[PDB]
RNA sequence: CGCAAGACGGACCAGAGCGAAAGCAUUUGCCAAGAAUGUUUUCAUUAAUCAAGAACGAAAGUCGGAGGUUCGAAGACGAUCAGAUACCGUCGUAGUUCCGACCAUAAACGAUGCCGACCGGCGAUGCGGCGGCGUUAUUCCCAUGACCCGCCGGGCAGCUUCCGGGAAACCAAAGUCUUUGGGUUCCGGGGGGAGUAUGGUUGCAAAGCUGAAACUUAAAGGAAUUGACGGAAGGGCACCACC
């Protein structure tokens, strides 16, 4: 499996037991019309690029 | 409605109400002139017959018994009679 | 004291009284 | 004080119904008394349907469903948060939640 | 009002009821409103008898014209459908309008700023305007109410059987009864039709206000 | 039933329904009707057919319940049993 | 947390309601209006009131506000609410009428009109919502 | 893959039906029974409620057989705990199942005796009957089914309401009650002592029915309200919380 890049198009909510993970709508900038919801640590704003070590998981929504 | 004319109810109301519960107790049954096509004569059948009504010498069966108003055989005409 | 177990203790106590009254008969 | 008018069950002209065994415990609950769910459920949730669709032999295979009918005792049901305590006015609403 | 040619139902008034649809009642029926219905349709709609509608309109008009002070007949609608009609009825009759949000205790609490104390309430719908009816229980207030086949006659003291749901039918009933009280006061003659148009009293969808503003140019 | 050589020749031993489908069919607010027929074919095969049937809520039906009378159900079951004996 | 308290809003509403015509959209002019037409002991509260005044003036430019009244009330609810069309939606050429509405007009004096199109009745008597 | 035995009839199954109640759920047949509707059928007061007396009566329990799949009082063992003759777990006798006899009790509840009249409304539903546009099956129409729309009677109920009642919760009955009387049976009289002692009676037994007193005590209790609390549910806030 390759290491791919995805752009944050929308930051949905703040999930995690202590509210420690932004839950984020990511758009694959390789396959420009494929989008998944995905959990992210640290401060995330709209339009910063995530480095995914796999692109096949999909987080459970708020 | 407080002021109902219990003296003089409309016919629609008494036709609706149970036979025993009417202002004057009146039956919903009736007698009827029934004739089969084979035989000449007209037999007086009771609407709620509850018996296998035969004509003279059993020309045919006229009325088959049911829950309420007994069914007349297909081809047997009736006129309900009053006085 | 639950009223059922009170009724069970009063039955056992009666059952011992019928056991001890019988031994004079 | 009489809390529920129906007495928390659904017999009006019986005087006896048959006991079901609660699925969580083994508690014997009158059928009418038991809190009943009908769970239709896909054999795989969300993460595994992605994998089966790709590793299926067949052409756009519709996945089968797993049809359970859960019977709960009142204690199991409340503990497992199937039903829930409501306000005395809101108790009377027999509408199932959306 | 009854057995009089002067106050008999005219031909143009029937066409104003049939276009508006005041004959065309609700799906459901109140036991208190069986006497103000001709017959039920196929496709469960009740047809209101417009003769009995007309007699209850006159009786209401009598009740209002009997009130010597025109100011202290408080005319009420909560729903948008009536809020225009009741405000134009104030213009005509010289009544007091309460269009939308009837503050509870406006008849019962003195120290409230909007403390009205009428002789007669007029009500667009007994259900929507339940709170004016109920405060009419606490102060001796006779109540005229525009009633549907569905409406309950709790605390309504003369019922005008109508379609009080539809936009046109409400405004038309308010127009009819405004024109009747001004006729029966002797302000307007009866031979000629009335200058004020029945279409004036109709509530319009805010879609239709900007649709007319578009179609005006 | 027999093996010729590198070939397991098979013969009928019973139709069944996937419980996915069987459970799917059984829903509330309607009458489930079943009929078994212990039957024999022309040759010496003895089958035990199991029919199933579900009362249909009609196109214009407003009533939720959609149930049958007990005599209606056993007229259906008598028909099921007649039809399955007829076709075996 | 920049929520205006009741003391700011009540003051700001009454200041618009009584001195509407002296106000505008600029903060700094109606800041000095609020100085004249009211005796406000604070400078901060003066600004708060002037600020919410200007916010309500922008809201009034859009449309009418629930907690204030304008002098005519206001060329739309007063003047435009006297709208009259060419011909009424009542004045219809062909009025469609039910056969049973024709019957209650027949048991009225009005058994024969010229401009009533009596329609065919609604077949398939099915008008309720199914249960559950 | 089979085979055997013994339990039990899931889903359909419902605020649905039936039964005096206990209770009753695979199919088919037989045997008698029953409510309700239908009736311009018959008898003509034959009725309602009931000391004595009588039938039925969940489970457990008892006696004699037949059987023993599962579950499981007692028991043995493993855990937990300070202890744990509990809760949890593995086994496991009586029992659980059938027939014949006992037993006569349950929160046997709707904690609401039975019969009769009257007093609002609305939507349902079950059964039977009656009427009505229209769809649909037997197609070849009749008449029957399946629907739809209403009416009537009886049934399990439901919602709503300043009928009215009630300490209130609440109740179309728990209403028609100081404006007190339709008929009738059972039964209560502060809390304990006590459903005990004693006598009688029934039972193989367990126990049932009947059933006090001495003595003791100023409250016990019912409904509702406010708080406090919870090892109940949900919501909110804080670096004297967390991340």
DSSP letters for G55-119? HHHHHHHHS--TT---SSS-STTTTGGG---SS-SS--SSEEE-HHHHHHHHSSS-S--SSEEEP
Whether E5 is covered by a domain: the verdict is: no
Distance CA E50, CA E24 (A): 10
- Residue B36 marked as a ligand binder: yes
Any B CB within 8 A of E109 CB:
no
- Residue B76 marked as a ligand binder: no
Q: F70 CA to H40 C1', in Å?
A: 35
D11 contacts: CB under 8 Å, gap ≥ 6: D17, D30, D32
D53 contacts: CB under 8 Å, gap ≥ 6: D61
Q: Do F62 and G124 count as a contact with CB atoms less than 8 A apart?
A: no
What is the sign, positive or negative, of the torsion defined by CA atoms of A14, A16, A19, A20? negative
A33 contacts: CB under 8 Å, gap ≥ 6: none
Q: How many CB atoms are located within 10 Å of the residue F57 CB?
A: 14
Burial of B47: CB neighbours in 10 Å, binned 0-12, 13-18, 19+? middle
What is the sign, positive or negative, of the torsion defined by CA atoms of D22, D26, D30, D31? positive
Nearest to E125 by CA among E80, E175, E168, E67: E80
Burial of F79: CB neighbours in 10 Å, binned 0-12, 13-18, 19+? middle
Distance CA E145, CA E170 (A): 12
Tokens of residue E74, six digits: 């408080």
Any E CB within 8 A of B1 CB:
yes
CB F77 within 8 A of CB F55: no
Burial of E145: CB neighbours in 10 Å, binned 0-12, 13-18, 19+? buried
Q: How many CB atoms are located within 10 Å of the residue F51 CB?
A: 16
Q: List subunits contacting chain F, requiring 3 or more Cβ pairs under 8 Å.
A: D, G
Which CATH number belongs to the domain containing residue E182 in this structure? Answer: 3.40.50.10490
CA distance B29 to chain E (A): 28
CA distance D67 to chain F (A): 6
Any D CB within 8 A of A60 CB:
yes
SS3 E84: helix
Enumerate the domain spans of chain D. 1-98
Name the residue range of residue E195's domain.
13-217
Q: Do D46 and A56 count as a contact with CB atoms less than 8 A apart?
A: no
Q: What is the 3-state secondary structure (H, E, C) of chain C?
A: CCHHHHHHHHHHHHHHHHHHHHHHC
Helix, strand counts (H, E) of chain D: 2, 4
Distance CA E62, CA E204 (A): 30
Distance CA A4, CA A26 (A): 12
Any D CB within 8 A of A31 CB:
no
Q: Among chain D residues 11 through 50, which have CB within 7 angstroms of nucleic chain H?
A: 11-18, 20, 31-32, 36, 38
B81 contacts: CB under 8 Å, gap ≥ 6: B30, B31, B32, B33, B44
Task: Report, in angstroms and rounded to the nearest whole number, the Rg of chain B calculated over CA atoms.
Answer: 17
- What residues of chain F, 17 to 46, have a C-beta less than 8 Å from chain G? 29
Query: In this structure, is the CB of residue F30 within 7 Å of any atom belonging to strand H?
Result: yes
SS3 A7: strand
Residue D47: list chain A partners with CB under 8 A: 57-58
Any D CB within 8 A of F23 CB:
yes
Chains C and A touch (3+ CB pairs under 8 A): no
Enumerate the domain spans of chain A. 1-62
Any F CB within 8 A of D58 CB:
no
Query: In this structure, is the CB of residue B78 within 7 Å of any atom belonging to strand H?
Result: no
Nucleotides of chain H in contact with protein CB (under 7 A) are 2, 9-19, 21-29, 37-40, 108-112, 120-135, 142-153, 155-160, 162, 169-171, 174, 194-198, 206-207, 222-224, 232-234, 242-243
With b meaning 16 or more CB within 10 Å and e meaning fewer, what string describes E31-45? eebeebbbeebeeeb
Phi-psi region for residue B32, left (φ > 0), alpha (ψ -120 to 50) or beta?
beta
Tokens of residue E180, six digits: 């009747």
Q: Which residues pair with A37 in a beta bridge?
A: A25
Domain count within chain B:
1
Tokens of residue B50, six digits: 């509850």
Instruction: Write the residues followed by a gap in chain G (C–N more than 2.5 A).
Output: none
Any A CB within 8 A of D55 CB:
no
Distance CA E177, CA E22 (A): 13
Burial of F88: CB neighbours in 10 Å, binned 0-12, 13-18, 19+? middle
Q: C23 CA to H197 C1', in Å?
A: 19
Nearest to E181 by CA among E131, E120, E115: E120
With b meaning 16 or more CB within 10 Å and e meaning fewer, what string describes E178-190? bbbbbbbeeebee
Distance CA E204, CA F1 (A): 82
Distance CA C13, CA C19 (A): 10
CB E175 within 8 A of CB E200: yes
Q: Do D46 and A58 count as a contact with CB atoms less than 8 A apart?
A: yes
Per CATH, the homologous superfamily of domain D1-98 is Ribosomal protein S26 (3.30.1740.20)
Q: E109 CA to H163 C1', in Å?
A: 30
CB E14 within 8 A of CB G108: yes
CATH of domain A1-62: 2.40.50.140
The experimental technique used to determine this model is cryo-EM
Nearest to E105 by CA among E94, E92, E96, E114: E114
Query: In this structure, is the CB of residue A18 within 7 Å of any atom belonging to strand H?
Result: yes
Q: How many CB atoms are located within 10 Å of the residue E143 CB?
A: 22
CB E177 within 8 A of CB E60: yes
Query: In this structure, is the CB of residue D91 within 7 Å of any atom belonging to strand H?
Result: no
Strands G95-97 and G116-118: parallel
CATH architecture of the domain with range G6-62: Orthogonal Bundle (1.10)
Query: In this structure, is the CB of residue B25 within 7 Å of any atom belonging to strand H?
Result: no
Query: In this structure, is the CB of residue B81 within 7 Å of any atom belonging to strand H?
Result: no
Any A CB within 8 A of D50 CB:
yes
- What residues of chain G, 106 to 125, have a C-beta less than 8 Å from chain F? 124
Q: How many CA atoms within 13 Å lie on the side-chain side of B80? A: 6
CB D85 within 8 A of CB D60: no
Whether E2 is covered by a domain: the verdict is: no
Which CATH number belongs to the domain containing residue B65 in this structure? Answer: 2.20.25.100
CB G15 within 8 A of CB G34: yes
DSSP classification of residue G120: P
């Amino acid at each position: 499996q390759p290491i791919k890049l995805a752009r944050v198009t929308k930051v949905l909510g703040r999930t995690g037991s202590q509210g420690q993970c932004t839950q984020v709508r990511v758009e694959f900038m390789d396959d420009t019309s494929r989008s998944i919801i995905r959990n992210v640590k640290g401060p995330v704003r709209e339009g910063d690029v995530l480095t995914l070590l796999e692109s096949e998981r999909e987080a459970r929504r708020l | 409605p407080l002021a109902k004319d219990l003296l003089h109810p409309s016919p629609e109301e008494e036709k609706r109400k149970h036979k025993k519960k009417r202002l004057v107790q009146s039956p919903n049954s009736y007698f009827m002139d029934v004739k089969c096509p084979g035989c000449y004569k007209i037999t007086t059948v009771f609407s709620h017959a509850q018996t296998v009504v035969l004509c003279v010498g059993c020309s045919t069966v006229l009325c088959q018994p049911t829950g309420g108003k007994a069914r007349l055989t297909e081809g047997c005409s009736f006129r309900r009679k009053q006085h | 004291m639950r009223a059922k177990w009170r009724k069970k203790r009063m039955r056992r106590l009666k059952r011992k009284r019928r056991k001890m009254r019988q031994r004079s008969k | 004080t009489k809390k529920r008018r129906n007495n928390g069950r659904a017999k009006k002209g019986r005087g006896h119904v048959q006991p079901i065994r609660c699925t969580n415990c083994a508690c014997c609950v009158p059928k009418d008394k038991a809190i009943k769910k009908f769970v239709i459920r896909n054999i795989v949730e969300a993460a595994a349907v992605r994998d089966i669709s790709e590793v299926s032999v067949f052409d756009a295979y519709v996945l089968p469903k797993l049809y359970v009918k859960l019977h709960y005792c009142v204690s199991c049901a409340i503990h497992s948060k199937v039903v829930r305590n409501r306000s005395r006015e809101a108790r009377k609403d027999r509408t199932p939640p959306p | 009002s009854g057995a009089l040619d002067v106050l008999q139902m005219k031909e143009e008034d029937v066409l104003k009821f049939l276009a508006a649809g005041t004959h065309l009642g609700g799906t459901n029926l109140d036991f208190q409103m069986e006497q103000y219905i001709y017959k039920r349709k196929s496709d469960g709609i009740y047809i209101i008898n417009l003769k009995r509608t007309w007699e209850k309109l006159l009786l209401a008009a009598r009740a209002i014209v009997a009130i010597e002070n025109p100011a202290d007949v408080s005319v009420i609608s909560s729903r948008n459908t009536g809020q225009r009609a009741v405000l134009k009825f104030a213009a005509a009759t010289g009544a007091t309008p309460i269009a939308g949000r009837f503050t509870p205790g406006t008849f019962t609490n003195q120290i409230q700023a909007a403390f009205r104390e009428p002789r007669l309430l007029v009500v667009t719908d007994p259900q929507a305007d339940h709170q004016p009816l109920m405060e009419a229980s606490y102060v001796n207030l006779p109540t005229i109410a525009l009633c549907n086949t569905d409406s309950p006659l709790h605390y309504v003291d003369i019922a005008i059987p109508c379609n009080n749901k539809g936009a046109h039918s409400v405004g038309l009933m308010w127009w009819m009864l405004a024109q009747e009280v001004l006729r029966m006061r002797g302000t307007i003659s009866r031979e000629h039709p009335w200058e004020v148009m029945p279409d004036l009293y109709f509530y319009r969808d805010p879609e239709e206000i900007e649709k007319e503003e578009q179609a005006a140019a | 039933e027999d093996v010729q050589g590198k070939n397991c020749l098979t013969n009928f031993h019973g139709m069944d329904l996937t419980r996915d489908k069987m459970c799917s069919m059984v829903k509330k607010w309607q009458t489930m009707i079943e009929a078994h027929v212990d039957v024999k074919t022309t040759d010496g095969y003895l089958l035990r057919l199991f029919c199933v049937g579900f009362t249909k809520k009609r196109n214009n039906q407003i009533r939720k319940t959609s149930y049958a009378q007990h005599q209606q159900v056993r007229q259906i079951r008598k028909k099921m049993m007649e039809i399955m004996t007829r076709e075996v | 947390g920049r929520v205006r308290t009741k003391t700011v809003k009540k003051a700001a509403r009454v200041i618009i309601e009584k001195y509407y015509t002296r106000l505008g959209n600029d903060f700094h002019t109606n800041k000095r209006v609020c100085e004249e037409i009211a005796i406000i002991p604070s400078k901060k509260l003066r600004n708060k009131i002037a600020g919410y005044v200007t916010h309500l003036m922008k809201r009034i430019q859009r449309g009418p506000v629930r907690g204030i009244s304008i002098k005519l009330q206001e060329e739309e609810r007063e003047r435009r609410d006297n709208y009259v069309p060419e011909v009424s939606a009542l004045d219809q050429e062909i009025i469609e009428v039910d056969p049973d509405t024709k019957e209650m007009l027949k048991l009225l004096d009005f058994g024969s009109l010229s401009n009533l199109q009596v329609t065919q009745p609604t077949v398939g008597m099915n008008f309720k919502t199914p249960r559950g």
